[PDB]
Design a protein around this ligand. Structure first.
Ligand code: QBP
Length: 305
């Protein structure tokens, strides 16, 4: 496939303010979304059908993430806390307290006994899921932390910040193992490891995505054409069909690139405001996208390749 052919299948309405993130459950059955309206919503991944609302945060939510067994969620909120949720019961199992300002990003490790978080307070924290206690506080950055992610075996954490740095941390010790710098350091608005753990994908507010070989500290690929000068927009590796990079954009489109050739292969039209978040289904050729306040909807897209 020189190109995918994603086409719109469902539009999901219900959030009453900007959506902030969307994530597919690892078992592929569900989509979770978080919003400035202080709510988490659960939707069917294949039919787009609204399932349930999960409530409890006192202010808007910036991010949500799934545990590996698809049974728990963690959410990051402007109320300076994270909450761990039992999805089936809707119960808040733990409230993770410690950050001194807005919490912007969160993720489980693969084993899902740990949670990592990043905050406006410029720190990265590592939490024990079962006790809800903070294990480590990392003096990670000198500006707000925009993303945090574990690698494939959980031994590394990558963090990014508006200070222009991506850093790699040892989970066990909390030591800073690496700082990634290019020829220039625009604010970094998103970062994550590749599925095989060998690479890092970073978004910067100069309208650019970069693929880094972090063990060698070198920038390999570069993806442009989209618009990103303001917001924390998620980006993804799509690997179920052809190998693509997928991202939202401030011109209201979903951008899809050939991972290898860096060429734009598709631009998905339909949203009426900034596409702040995209997610890729774990086993099927399905993308979810979500948009900001003037739109408020989530869209599900499907390709034959
Ligand atoms: F060589 C490329 F193009 F840089 C590259 C980058 C990432 C991956 C990959 N596979 N799985 N996860 N990441 C494969 C190839």
């Amino acid at each position: 496939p020189v190109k995918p052919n994603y086409a719109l299948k469902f539009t999901l309405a219900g959030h009453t303010k900007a959506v902030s993130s969307v994530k597919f459950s690892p078992n592929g059955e569900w989509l979770a979304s978080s919003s400035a309206d202080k709510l988490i919503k659960i939707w069917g991944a294949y039919d787009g059908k609204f399932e349930k609302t999960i409530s409890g945060h006192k202010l808007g939510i910036s991010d949500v993430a799934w545990s590996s067994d698809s049974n728990l969620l963690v959410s990051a909120s402007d109320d300076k806390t994270l909450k761990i949720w039992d999805v089936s019961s809707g119960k808040c199992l733990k409230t993770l307290k410690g950050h001194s300002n807005y919490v912007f990003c969160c993720n489980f490790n693969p084993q899902s006994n740990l949670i990592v978080s990043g905050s406006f307070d410029e720190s990265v924290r590592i939490w024990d899921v079962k006790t809800g206690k903070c294990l480590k506080t990392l003096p990670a950055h000198s500006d707000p932390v925009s993303a945090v992610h574990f690698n494939r075996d959980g031994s590394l954490i990558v963090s990014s910040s508006y200070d222009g740095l991506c850093r790699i941390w040892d989970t066990a010790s909390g030591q800073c193992l690496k700082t990634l710098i290019d020829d220039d350091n625009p604010p970094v608005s998103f970062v994550k490891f590749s599925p095989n753990g060998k690479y890092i994908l970073a978004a910067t507010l100069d309208n650019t995505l970069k693929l880094w070989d972090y063990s060698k500290g070198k920038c390999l690929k570069t993806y442009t054409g989209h618009k990103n000068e303001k917001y924390c927009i998620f980006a993804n590796f799509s690997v179920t069909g052809g190998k693509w990079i997928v991202s939202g954009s401030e011109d209201n489109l979903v951008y899809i690139w050939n991972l290898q050739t860096k060429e734009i292969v598709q631009k998905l039209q339909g949203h009426t405001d900034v596409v702040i978040s995209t997610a890729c289904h774990p086993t099927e050729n399905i993308i979810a996208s979500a948009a900001l306040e003037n739109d408020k909807t989530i869209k599900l897209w499907k390709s034959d390749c």
